[PDB]
Design a protein around this ligand. Structure first.
Ligand code: CL
Ligand code: CL
Ligand code: CL
Ligand code: CL
Ligand code: CL
Ligand code: CL
Ligand code: CL
Ligand code: CL
Ligand code: ZN
Lengths: 201, 201
């Protein structure tokens, strides 16, 4: 029988956010009238688990398309890696054109924001871009740091790769999954919070 | 080859909102750094008991395994005004089913005050069947019923409420549903991205 893995981070004031910046925190506003409670959520589009798509995918009631966010993926255990994922750490792996790959790293075993998270280095990004994968997910809130001019994002976007950031892959074994990465259906944005689920084989 | 139907309303400033209230509109903010400020009952969403019950269970208490799994979509587009017990008594509705009702609402783009809602007697019938959930294609599952007996009857039986479905493109029948809401903590509802597959994936 099918296992469903919830690989999404929860959303609440005081949650881990990028570089611990107070302004990146979400805000909940409640209003009560008798027994009726209603609220508003005000959040960064890059909060917690989120999708970042190439600009050209979005701008109608135009939204990030689902063709690639919903389908088979491959999750690789890269918990041995230190500092950053390089081409050398991923070149021998079974990664093909059209694939959606997720990287479980040491990030998954930390609960707070850490500045020196495991990120995808330029050379690994260019390899993945040139391979023409359809997506890549990482388990830190950003897929890149310590690289002026954001070359990892830009190479992946040139090739049309969608990026998922802020996955929580701790309890997920290496293997194949059916992924449903379902972003908030917000018109016009190329970035959106998402609920990402992985299903057995 | 499996079809996925996205049954989620798009979110944008100017969208259909409940009773056309301008304070129910969502708000996007860019600071060139981008935010969305929205009512948790915008568009397609899941209600948490807290919405109608003071100190009621909040959103993270909704079991994700109830939101993922087989469901049944019924065509009730012939109905007028409301769905009564008499409209649904004959349908194959068992214990633990997730049932979705397509109504005249799915064929309307704007908000309508006289939307098709689930009536008190139908809510009571569903609670006694011990269904795991009900979805409707109106922004609210209830109107013109002082004291909100439909939410309450349904909440008391542990029945999950999805509102805001867009179902005009999905044929009557059996689906594997993934209703994937943002992972909000302590809220009365959460916007959900809902997808319907015509076989398990
Ligand atoms: Cl789409
Ligand atoms: Cl294999
Ligand atoms: Cl629509
Ligand atoms: Cl939604
Ligand atoms: Cl949840
Ligand atoms: Cl659960
Ligand atoms: Cl009728
Ligand atoms: Cl059916
Ligand atoms: Zn609602």
């Amino acid at each position: 029988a099918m296992k469903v893995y919830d690989v999404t981070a929860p959303i609440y004031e005081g949650m881990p956010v990028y570089k611990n910046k107070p302004e990146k925190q979400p805000k909940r506003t409640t209003i009560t009238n008798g027994y009726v409670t209603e609220s508003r959520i005000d959040m960064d589009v890059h909060t917690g688990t989120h999708i970042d798509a190439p600009l050209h995918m979005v701008e109608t009631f135009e939204t990030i398309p689902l063709n690639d966010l919903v389908g088979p993926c491959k999750l690789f255990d890269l918990t041995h890696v230190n500092d950053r994922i390089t081409k050398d750490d991923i070149a021998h792996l079974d990664i093909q054109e059209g694939d959606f790959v997720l990287f479980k790293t040491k990030n998954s075993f930390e609960d707070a924001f850490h500045f020196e998270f495991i990120f995808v280095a330029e050379d690994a990004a260019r390899y993945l871009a040139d391979k023409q994968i359809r997506g890549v997910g990482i388990d830190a809130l950003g897929i890149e740091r310590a690289q002026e001019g954001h070359p990892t994002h830009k190479t992946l976007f040139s090739a049309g790769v969608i990026i998922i950031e802020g996955l929580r892959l701790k309890d997920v074994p290496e293997g194949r999954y059916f992924m449903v990465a379902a972003p908030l259906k917000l018109v016009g944005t190329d970035a959106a919070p998402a609920r990402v689920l992985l299903f057995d084989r």
